[PDB]
Ligand binder design. Sequence first.
Ligand SMILES: NC(=O)c1ccc[n+]([C@@H]2O[C@H](COP(=O)([O-])OP(=O)(O)OC[C@H]3O[C@@H](n4cnc5c(N)ncnc54)[C@H](OP(=O)(O)O)[C@@H]3O)[C@@H](O)[C@H]2O)c1
Ligand SMILES: NC(=O)c1ccc[n+]([C@@H]2O[C@H](COP(=O)([O-])OP(=O)(O)OC[C@H]3O[C@@H](n4cnc5c(N)ncnc54)[C@H](OP(=O)(O)O)[C@@H]3O)[C@@H](O)[C@H]2O)c1
Ligand SMILES: CCc1nc(N)nc(N)c1-c1ccc(OCCCOc2ccc(-c3c(N)nc(N)nc3CC)cc2)cc1
Ligand SMILES: CCc1nc(N)nc(N)c1-c1ccc(OCCCOc2ccc(-c3c(N)nc(N)nc3CC)cc2)cc1
Ligand SMILES: O=c1ccn([C@H]2C[C@H](O)[C@@H](COP(=O)(O)O)O2)c(=O)[nH]1
Ligand SMILES: O=c1ccn([C@H]2C[C@H](O)[C@@H](COP(=O)(O)O)O2)c(=O)[nH]1
Lengths: 542, 547
Amino acid sequence: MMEQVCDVFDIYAICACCKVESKNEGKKNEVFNNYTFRGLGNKGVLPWKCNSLDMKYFCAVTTYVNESKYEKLKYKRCKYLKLQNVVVMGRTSWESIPKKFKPLSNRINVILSRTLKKEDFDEDVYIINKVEDLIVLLGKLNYYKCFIIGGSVVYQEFLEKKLIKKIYFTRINSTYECDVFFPEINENEYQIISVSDVYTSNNTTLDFIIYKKTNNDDEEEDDFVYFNFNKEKEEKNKNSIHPNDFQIYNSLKYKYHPEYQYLNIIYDIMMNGNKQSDRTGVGVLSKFGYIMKFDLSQYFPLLTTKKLFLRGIIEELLWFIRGETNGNTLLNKNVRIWEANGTREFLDNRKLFHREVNDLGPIYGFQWRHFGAEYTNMYDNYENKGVDQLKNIINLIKNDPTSRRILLCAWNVKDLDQMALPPCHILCQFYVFDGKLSCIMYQRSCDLGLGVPFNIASYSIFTHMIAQVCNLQPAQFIHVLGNAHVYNNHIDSLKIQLNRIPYPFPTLKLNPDIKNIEDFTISDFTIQNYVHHEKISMDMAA
Amino acid sequence: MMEQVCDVFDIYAICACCKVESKNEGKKNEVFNNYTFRGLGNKGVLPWKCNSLDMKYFCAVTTYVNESKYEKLKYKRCKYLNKETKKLQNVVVMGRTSWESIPKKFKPLSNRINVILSRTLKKEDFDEDVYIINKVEDLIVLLGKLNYYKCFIIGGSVVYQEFLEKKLIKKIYFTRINSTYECDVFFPEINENEYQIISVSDVYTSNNTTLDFIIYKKTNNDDEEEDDFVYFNFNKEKEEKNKNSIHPNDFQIYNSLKYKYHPEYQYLNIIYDIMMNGNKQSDRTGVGVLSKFGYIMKFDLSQYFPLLTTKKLFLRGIIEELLWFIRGETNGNTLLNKNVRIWEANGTREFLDNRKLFHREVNDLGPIYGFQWRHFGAEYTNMYDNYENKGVDQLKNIINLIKNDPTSRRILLCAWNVKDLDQMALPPCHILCQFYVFDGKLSCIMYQRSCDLGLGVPFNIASYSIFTHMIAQVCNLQPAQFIHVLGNAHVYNNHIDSLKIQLNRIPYPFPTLKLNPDIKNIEDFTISDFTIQNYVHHEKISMDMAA
Ligand SMILES: NC(=O)c1ccc[n+]([C@@H]2O[C@H](COP(=O)([O-])OP(=O)(O)OC[C@H]3O[C@@H](n4cnc5c(N)ncnc54)[C@H](OP(=O)(O)O)[C@@H]3O)[C@@H](O)[C@H]2O)c1
Ligand SMILES: NC(=O)c1ccc[n+]([C@@H]2O[C@H](COP(=O)([O-])OP(=O)(O)OC[C@H]3O[C@@H](n4cnc5c(N)ncnc54)[C@H](OP(=O)(O)O)[C@@H]3O)[C@@H](O)[C@H]2O)c1
Ligand SMILES: CCc1nc(N)nc(N)c1-c1ccc(OCCCOc2ccc(-c3c(N)nc(N)nc3CC)cc2)cc1
Ligand SMILES: CCc1nc(N)nc(N)c1-c1ccc(OCCCOc2ccc(-c3c(N)nc(N)nc3CC)cc2)cc1
Ligand SMILES: O=c1ccn([C@H]2C[C@H](O)[C@@H](COP(=O)(O)O)O2)c(=O)[nH]1
Ligand SMILES: O=c1ccn([C@H]2C[C@H](O)[C@@H](COP(=O)(O)O)O2)c(=O)[nH]1
């Protein structure tokens, strides 16, 4: 009955917007949102000069054509009246391009000039004086899809004009000085339905998202139904958890951003979890056995759907590497991760009656550097006692990289009961190939709301640390979850969190002068270009 | 090249076959093939009497229609007959004898058009809303006159026989009932030039037998969605790592299959993935490998025992091993005296000396798996010592925890004792076991740091599946999942040709494991408390073809 113009002539927008130089109140509590990425141009060029992968994406999207679908499209376009896509740009933009790469290859180029007229453009490029003139020009042409590509105000002229069907939008995750903003996309008009894998090109991370116009072989298909004949017409926590709760999450089609490996596991435990009591007395939803993989060559996987802070987590890791068991070393730096596990009362309830407050016993650090040595107190001298696993793994990686025995184990069975509590991060295995280091960490118990997000960062940083001091490049961090759980108190915060759309991940920089694993200090670590959503108190109370 | 009758009128076969009683004389070793599964009936009824799940599948396939596709099917059938153009149903077609063994309460089959082949009876002999036909040609005539989705031949062996002989079946939906029963009626031997398996289901248990569902195919003797997928796939290049050393036709059958849902494919796909994308690397061994890092398999022990089927495996050895572990033994002589040699090479004078264990007696393997399970932290002396009450008896602790603190996230069994690694004949590959109890059911994750896919993993799966059963039983729970995590996952080069062969065999329904139910303590099990039932498998593959 009714159908809109954009949908009929298949009219699209494709852009790339970087972060924009600013100056703010004082502190860097800089709130991020979608308008964060708006930088289109600087003085006739891209604010970043050159990006080999966005270029490959642009050329891929604006020259891809599917002939065997044209029949349907032609039929559509005529019902009011070699195949190539149409690209459309403003004048500034067309003169920004070298004559080398003009006209744009395999594309019907179409410029908007109120000025110079048709009869001097010597190729087969078209020209039109107004945006309603394009519509008529697509009537007289055989083309697949039409792509607006061109300058601030050409795009601007479509918030009200509503001729765009989808925005193909590259997020370039780095700050450049910019002459031209991009129009503020109205959340009520266009909504994101797809997010890509995160990449590294030309010394920045970037991802590709898709906004869509809001509306406010045949045989073997039955065989699939047949093979699914023994499902349930329901879920499990359909009695607990509702559909409409995950409206933005469920609305997405392509969820390829690596942050979805974490969010999807939350989803899976919420929808399919098993309801259990536990040691705490808050209950959980639990499942058993998952795996995530992060590509550290391309990004640093610091969750972006909430705010995470890493000073504490980095000090803790530095404190593990030194071999320390002294809770006080962390408390004097206002790192309080282990405080509650070092109190008189907590140690008493563990039957550690003869243990000094904050003497956490032969926990991670003592096992990494002194496995099997007899623990006394947090102040004794342990130099050259026990097995220095940490040193042994760095020597294996350097000298026998194809060894299958490169493991770092904290689960010392003899010593569990002397620990303030037994370790969650059971062990680390390493794999080296083609100058690259990959790390698996097995976690026996995984608090998906609070713990896991830090656990990922922690072992990613460590995989970087281990790689730099071994003259290797980081490849994958691989996280295996044993008993994976969402505390009930976290459920509401995590519903909120699943409905947020990830930003491209940050990068981690290490001070490259550090060549020995003992030699890192807090200042040697820098998280760059961390774009993130607002913090979530995971227990929303007090 | 024009249209056959079975394609136009969508004529299919669906059956269930069990295994059939016999006796073997040259070797007790039974040979198995597709024709292993051929029992259809017995004294007028099903050989197994009843099977709820096969029933439920039968009902799903023979009553499922998609209204959206009928318009097109009409056209197809109208265009072939040279003709133009209440809820839609399927046809089922059966022999008279099959009709006569169906109870009246189920007759005619609900929500389906029933058609009965008979010479000796005619429509007057039936009260029921059914079509009678007296030759095969008349079914074609009828199907041309009726409105229907698909047409399923539902048996009689006489009916299956003549319909397969005339090439009138487009696919066979074949249920493999993996048990043996008395039979007098048989399904015809299929012709593998005429019909190829293209899909294999998950494996299930129903009514005290496993079963799966396969599909044979007749051999030839809002939609702006697709485009975004192509965009997001703009940076994945077209070739694979070793594809130029690993050739398409070497996986002809493997890759010809459409749905590979049998749980054995979790193993077979990891092999495939290492062959195609694995890293070429040297190793401790000198043989070199293809390797990758980080995989997970899951097997549902409530539904089957995942003993691989695409090659022959025996378990006496790995069961004796496991019992030896449980007793806490480190004496390799104990196994050799049971003619189990799994630990033999690791125990020689030479091997021990090359590990620098010059003061270790031959076959004294040191503080390995069993010692760590029963005495972690104790000082190892020799294999004859009495270590009673020394070290942490981890095995007893996890049983206690499973019984009395089932929701603990600390039920772990760890063999990687970092202090004792060098005193071991060799360091452990199966590093740890973690347990999980929900709803009277026990799952097990085992993490394996180093995984020989050709040779060890198949035994490793088996081992830890039995141990999940043993532990579950002595804690009064039901076994649920065995979950297997592979770290360094590798294919030895010498094994490739042999795995290329294995990846093109089609799995059989898995067997079942039963344990003596009287054993209520983990230490009281003996070899004869274990039975593998209904193991159907392809032939032995020696992985060294150089042997
Ligand atoms: N990152 C990205 O996605 C992207 C994409 C394209 C370009 N750029 C960059 O951005 C910069 C250019 O930005 P810009 O906004 O100035 O580019 P532009 O859109 O090429 O320039 C504006 C011009 O387009 C024409 N125009 C605009 N609205 C019109 C209308 N309603 N009817 C007819 N003509 C109309 C006018 O030409 P007349 O003067 O002839 O009237 C106007 O001066 C360059 O540095 C370029 O490299 C970036
Ligand atoms: N496990 C399974 O998948 C499955 C499926 C179906 C049946 N069954 C079992 O198999 C047994 C029945 O098999 P069966 O071969 O003995 O019987 P059947 O194939 O059901 O019966 C054949 C009878 O149907 C008629 N018939 C067959 N072909 C015909 C043709 N071309 N034209 C006219 N009439 C034709 C004849 O009926 P008249 O004698 O009246 O001429 C013939 O005697 C039973 O035990 C039943 O439970 C098993
Ligand atoms: C690849 C950049 C890009 N990415 C995305 N995602 N959307 C866009 N609209 C654009 C884009 C932006 C501006 C634009 O205007 C023309 C001037 C911009 O600067 C360029 C861009 C690309 C090139 C270039 C190049 N260096 N090499 C080749 N082969 N082809 C091209 C033409 C696309 C030269 C100058 C065209 C496309
Ligand atoms: C479910 C058995 C089956 N599975 C598969 N996969 N294919 C077949 N062709 C058949 C098959 C169908 C009919 C048939 O007729 C021979 C007579 C004995 O078979 C019966 C009898 C009763 C029932 C039965 C039952 N036991 N309970 C109900 N509710 N409904 C029904 C009829 C569908 C099923 C099979 C034999 C085999
Ligand atoms: O680094 C850590 C440490 C702890 N936990 C969580 C998992 C459990 O919720 C709790 C430890 O309790 P037990 O699993 O030990 O009972 O802490 C983590 O997720 N990450
Ligand atoms: O139960 C076992 C024992 C050994 N291996 C394989 C893994 C490696 O190929 C080899 C051990 O060598 P290292 O990983 O120890 O180098 O044996 C298994 O797969 N399973």
